[PDB]
Amino acid sequence: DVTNVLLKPVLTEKVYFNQMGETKKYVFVVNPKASKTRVKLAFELVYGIKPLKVNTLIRKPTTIRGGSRFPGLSKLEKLAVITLPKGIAISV
Amino acid sequence: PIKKIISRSNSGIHHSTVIDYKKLLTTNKNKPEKSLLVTLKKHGGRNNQGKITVRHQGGRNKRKYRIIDFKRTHYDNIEATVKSIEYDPNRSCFVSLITYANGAKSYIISPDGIKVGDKILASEHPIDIKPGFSMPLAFIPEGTQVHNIELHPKGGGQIARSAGSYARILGQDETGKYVILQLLSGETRKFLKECRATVGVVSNLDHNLVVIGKAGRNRHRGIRPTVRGSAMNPNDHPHGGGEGRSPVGRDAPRTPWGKRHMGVKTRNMKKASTNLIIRNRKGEQ
Amino acid sequence: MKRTYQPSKLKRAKTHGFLARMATASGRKVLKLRRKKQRAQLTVSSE
Amino acid sequence: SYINKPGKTSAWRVMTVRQQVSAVLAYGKIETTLKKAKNTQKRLDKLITLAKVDNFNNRRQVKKWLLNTNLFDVDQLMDHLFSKVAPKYEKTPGGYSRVLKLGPRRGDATEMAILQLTD
RNA sequence: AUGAGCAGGUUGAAGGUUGAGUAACAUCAACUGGAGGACCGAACCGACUCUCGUUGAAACGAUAGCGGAUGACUUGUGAUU
RNA sequence: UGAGUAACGCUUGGGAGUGAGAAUCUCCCAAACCGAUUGACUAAGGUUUCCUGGACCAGGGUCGUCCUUCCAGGGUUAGUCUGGACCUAAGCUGAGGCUGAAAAGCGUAGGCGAUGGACAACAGGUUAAUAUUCCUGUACUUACAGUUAGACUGAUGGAGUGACAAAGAAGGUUUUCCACCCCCAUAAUUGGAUUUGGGGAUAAAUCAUAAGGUGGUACAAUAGGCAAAUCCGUUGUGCAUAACAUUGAGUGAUGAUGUCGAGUGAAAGUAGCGAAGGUGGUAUUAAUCAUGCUUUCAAGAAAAGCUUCUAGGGUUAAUCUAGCUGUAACCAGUACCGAGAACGAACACACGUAGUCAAGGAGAGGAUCCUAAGGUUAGCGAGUGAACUAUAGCCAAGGAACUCUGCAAAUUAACCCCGUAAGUUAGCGAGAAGGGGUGCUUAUGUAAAAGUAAGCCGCAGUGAAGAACGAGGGGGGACUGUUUAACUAAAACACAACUCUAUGCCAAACCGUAAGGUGAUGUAUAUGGGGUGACACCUGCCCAGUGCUGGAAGGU
Ligand SMILES: [Mg+2]
Ligand SMILES: [Mg+2]
Ligand SMILES: [Mg+2]
Ligand SMILES: [Mg+2]
Ligand SMILES: [Mg+2]
Ligand SMILES: [Mg+2]
Ligand SMILES: [Mg+2]
Ligand SMILES: [Mg+2]
Ligand SMILES: [Mg+2]
């Protein structure tokens, strides 16, 4: 409920391609230590719409900046898609 | 009795033999009763440290220990009845599945002669002498074949329970207690008169006449190759080394370790049981 | 031919892992030595 | 060295000749190495001179050499040949193709040449 | 400890049944049965020979042959000395 | 310096296009190899190597507009898949404790530990990248609350089941297959065609059916199952031949007015459109029933789980079963490669790496040759065709004269048919040796085919590809096996068997200081150790010396 489990929404062409359907599957990146029940409860508290389904995945850190004399590591983040009832939509 | 196996597999010749298992057993199908089976974990010659303490022991098949009642204590003056005679992989002899009147199944070591439907009893009062009966040695008359003897009273039949073994009664001692026994292999001992036993020789008398033909059969039986000393190197064995088929060098043959081996007495004389011995397969004490 | 390093991350973790090196006194001693040398990859637990 | 490429076996040589002459019939010009055009020209001339009769036997003989191309399949290439290429050469005794030399390639300095046929 | 694998095709034991035979045995003939650290031979395992290679393709290999190939077999995973 | 020398570590040709630059990039057409695999799905392993756009410093044994390289952006979606929240095997760890200068070692209750057990989801579609996860269609499972009907519920404990070896054979069942039929396109300039080519399908799930398989059955007594049991076990009685219980491949219907579908095809072979989507047999094929059955001995996991039993509870009720309404279903993996370029080999290294799918022709076959589905252009080329090297092909006459030796190479080779000696442990020798036939057509063959007859052709008829060369005598080891990874595979080691020796259980021997453990949950028909090494016949003399055992007087 602290709403420290909704870090950011991501807007990619795949996300839009899913948006021009009818379920309007909104997606977010969430606190990796959180869970699907916490994510859906937070979504209910922040918008007021009870979600239909939640699916999650996490992107493992990888080598970034290649060979540049100072290579680093990427960010480990969890993405949580949030389906909705067919006849509803909301902004972000 | 043994049944000769004719291989006719044209790669060498082997005159192997095997106990008949057909006219001696009953219900030759391997269908043991469930309630008294516990699996044996094959130590494989090794030890809790994981090292090898006993050489050439490993590779046996997977067995299931048949819980055998040696003590014969919880059931007294309650009649039983032999149900079948199976082949027990763990030991050389044959096991009978008996059934007491109350309805508690158990395994005992089958004396030779018994068949399905016979009736046996075990108690502490003077009873009959038919094979399978059990009673303290103080009541058994002299001369009868006896097995499943134990050293300490209420201890369970450690002594003389192998296939085709027995022991002859030889009366009592002059002290009144310590009834004298003529154990197999010449040794004569003294047993307390309150020790239990069972009359009748042990069945499967022809386990000695078997002739294992193939090496693989022996290996499946749990035995591994034994490398002689003369094949060894001068390290790892006192008989090793030598530039080809050397004879034993030292004064006397040696063990893999330095201990003297041939013809050397090794029993510990300072055991309380020494007073119980009359002859030790060669001579007095 | 079959070389001498067939990888299996489970075996690596159970053998050289941190908790494996925290099981015996000698493991604690070698951990102390590695802290003294300040090695960044202290154990195989860190990639 | 014991194992090696199959190399330029007789079958590979004659199949390359087949492919090149088929391509010449299809298009009319080829940019290939000079010392391959100088060999292909023989079979090219033989096929051109053999096709000035249009009997079924000559078409059967021609079948032994042609290979289908993106522009023309084998049967359509036969029809093209025996219908318009051979009539163009009904009075020239031999020498139906010319092999002129280009500049060397930057890759291998090999001496590319054009195998071309015209009256 | 726990699983897995052995393309295919041969040979036809013991035992049993039937009949003969025997006073009863033994033994003989036909049918059944399908055994073997059995056979031939792919995957698999191994390394007996020649050549090549020896700053090699390779810190032990390649073509060609070669031996075993239902077992004292081969192999994955886990544990231990 | 060696030196612009060896080497560049399994293969092509052409058209068009881009671009400054083209053998090496893109597209197109062929071509050649792989095709029991370079084809497809994955475990482990790697950790972004995946997709799109851009770049060609560096890396690519050459070039580069291009790359598994570099830069920018993007991509993995699970109540049902793999693992955890369930269960234990080997084993690990281990409160107390035992043991040990100290550190520590062993070990009990407990707790972990899959390579195994139990457990609910299928077909299709969709993107550049994911799909039993997303979407459509259809379902299933478990909790939780309420409601309705019925019923007394029964554990942390007991019992049953769970629950298992190897080999082999037969049978049911659809399949493969064949034949017929249906549908679609196809009618051919090179001589003759009145055909040729392709396709003929559907899941989980619910209901009914179900060939079969498994195994006495019901009643009455109970002195056993830490405690009680109606359960199990035990004992009698009648019925027994099928009844009962249990399980069961497949079949039928819905699922499906759907999807797929040969092809047709516009803006791409793509969107779309898309016909038939069957009959009978089978002396062949696989897969299931099957954790079924038979035989043999080397006698073939545990726990959880499921059913049941009472205990204990409930009674002014709980709890369970069934239906209906409603709510919920957690965490981690999900990309890609999976190998002659992403892993282990320092490499874009000819090497190694578990499992699964495994088409056609001849073929017993996954052997062999050419191919189907599908994939590739072995990341230096072009010339010449000298010596010389390697790998092939062949060689007249002779046929081991070579040589340390027939090393190497050469002959035979498949199926069918005659024919097979000495010796022997009577099993073998033995595919012994030595010979004959195979092609095609017609006829006859039977159920197919082998077989048979007639005829024809060639030098040749498993016309190619894949198939044992034997004979005789001797030494050794009885035999199958194992052995010096990376110079020695044998006469060496082991082996079944023989003998001797030790050991009566807290056994001898062994690891450890010791607890403790192996020996062994075994008991002299057993176990440890030395020596010989099937089998057949034998194993002679010497106890002076040494070793061992025994000895009781004396000396030291
Ligand atoms: Mg040069
Ligand atoms: Mg020079
Ligand atoms: Mg030179
Ligand atoms: Mg060179
Ligand atoms: Mg490879
Ligand atoms: Mg593999
Ligand atoms: Mg094939
Ligand atoms: Mg092949
Ligand atoms: Mg010897």
Numbering used by the authors:
A (entry chain s): 2 to 93
B (entry chain a): 2 to 286
C (entry chain 0): 1 to 47
D (entry chain m): 2 to 120
The authors write:
Translation of genetic information through messenger RNAs (mRNAs) into proteins is performed by the ribosome, one of the primordial macromolecular machines in cells. The ribosome consists of a small and a large subunit (30S and 50S in prokaryotes), which form the aminoacyl (A), peptidyl (P) and exit (E) transfer RNA (tRNA) binding sites at their interface. During the elongation phase, the ribosome undergoes a fundamental cycle to add one amino acid to the nascent peptide chain, which can be subdivided into three steps: decoding, peptidyl transfer and translocation. Here, we use these technical advances to perform large-scale structure classification and spatial analysis of ribosomes, to visualize parts of the translation process in great detail inside M. pneumoniae as a prokaryotic minimal cell model.
To investigate the structural details of the translation machinery, we first obtained 3.5-Å consensus maps by averaging all ribosomes detected in cryo-electron tomograms of intact M. pneumoniae cells (Supplementary Discussion and Methods). Focused refinements on the 30S and 50S subunits improved the map quality and revealed well-resolved ribosomal RNA (rRNA) bases and ribosomal protein amino acid side chains. The high-resolution in-cell consensus maps allowed us to build de novo an atomic model for the M. pneumoniae ribosome. The structure shows high similarity to other bacterial ribosomes, but also reveals several new features. Specifically, 11 of the 52 ribosomal proteins in M. pneumoniae have extended sequences compared to E. coli. Most of these extensions are predicted to be disordered, but those of ribosomal proteins S6, L22 and L29 form secondary structures and were built in the model. We found such extensions to be common throughout the bacterial kingdom (Supplementary Discussion and Supplementary Table 2), possibly representing ribosome diversity in adaptation to different environments and lifestyles.
